């Protein structure tokens, strides 16, 4: 995150860390949607143009963390993957359309003060909150700047959803209905953005109706970090919810 702040303790108990076994390194963020399922961006696992093709065995999930590099003994829980599921139409060849994947844990995790799942939006939540000007929140242990570094604690930043045309005119990539963009305008005199390391994390909003936190987007792609006239792009979780339901009920939950 660029121009965020340190999160408070237990502020995003659904924030997961995707961790490389060896070398030991932070791959991406992710989020806990129940006691066995994690939601992330497909391009954290599979990205052929960079020879990236992670397997179940190559990874670890770390839940309940605060600090980026310490092993938070008696706080954090580290799990193993049972299986990875990528959207069958994830489009890595052209724009990362449908950048989403589920990870089924080897065993259910136990909730605690620092570990708790976020909700998945229903059609009506999506309809009231996904609006231009409304703010969401992104969290992650990624870069502090486009190039220099690494925070020592989970960072946060609140950002406004931006109107589709402003999104489309800021880039040359073809934007689809499975993506939305967020960020302040050069005008606005306020900064912020996800950056390298943040991918796969959650863009969340808190419903004013029922007081619950919902995950509306997944940190997906951007051009640089925090550049003027550029926005971050997020996978639209509600549009992809039926592939989500399908996998959860055809294979576990």
């Amino acid at each position: 995150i660029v121009e965020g702040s340190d999160a408070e303790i237990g502020m995003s108990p659904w924030q997961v860390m995707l961790f490389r076994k060896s070398p030991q390194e932070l791959l991406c963020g992710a989020s806990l949607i129940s006691d066995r399922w994690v939601l992330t961006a497909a391009h954290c696992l599979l990205y052929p143009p960079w020879d990236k093709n992670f397997t179940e065995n190559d990874l670890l999930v770390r839940i309940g963390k605060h600090s980026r590099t310490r092993y938070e003994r008696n706080i954090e829980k580290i799990s193993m993957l049972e299986k990875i599921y990528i959207h069958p139409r994830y489009n890595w060849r052209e724009n990362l359309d449908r950048d989403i994947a589920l990870m089924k844990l080897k065993k259910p995790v136990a909730f605690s003060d620092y570990i708790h799942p976020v909700c998945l939006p229903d059609r009506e939540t999506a309809a009231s909150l996904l609006q231009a000007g409304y703010k969401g929140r992104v969290t992650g242990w990624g870069n502090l700047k486009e190039t220099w570094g690494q925070p020592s604690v989970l960072q946060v930043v609140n950002l406004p959803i931006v109107e589709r045309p402003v999104c489309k005119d800021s880039t040359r990539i073809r934007i689809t209905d499975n993506m939305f963009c967020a960020g302040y305008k050069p005008d606005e005199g306020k900064r912020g953005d996800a950056c390298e390391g943040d991918s796969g994390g959650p863009f969340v909003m808190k419903s004013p109706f029922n007081n619950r936190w919902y995950q509306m987007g997944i940190v997906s792609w951007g051009e640089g970090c925090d550049r003027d006239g550029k926005y971050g792009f997020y996978t639209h979780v509600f549009r992809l919810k039926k592939w989500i339901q399908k996998v959860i009920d055809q294979f576990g939950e």
């Binding site: 076994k21 060896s22 932070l26 670890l60 590099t69 310490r70 092993y71 580290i78 193993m80 690494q150």
Partner: peptide, 10 residues
């Protein structure tokens, strides 16, 4: 820079 994790996890 990553602190070592228990081996029970590798």
């Amino acid at each position: 820079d990553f602190e070592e994790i228990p081996e029970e996890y590798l």
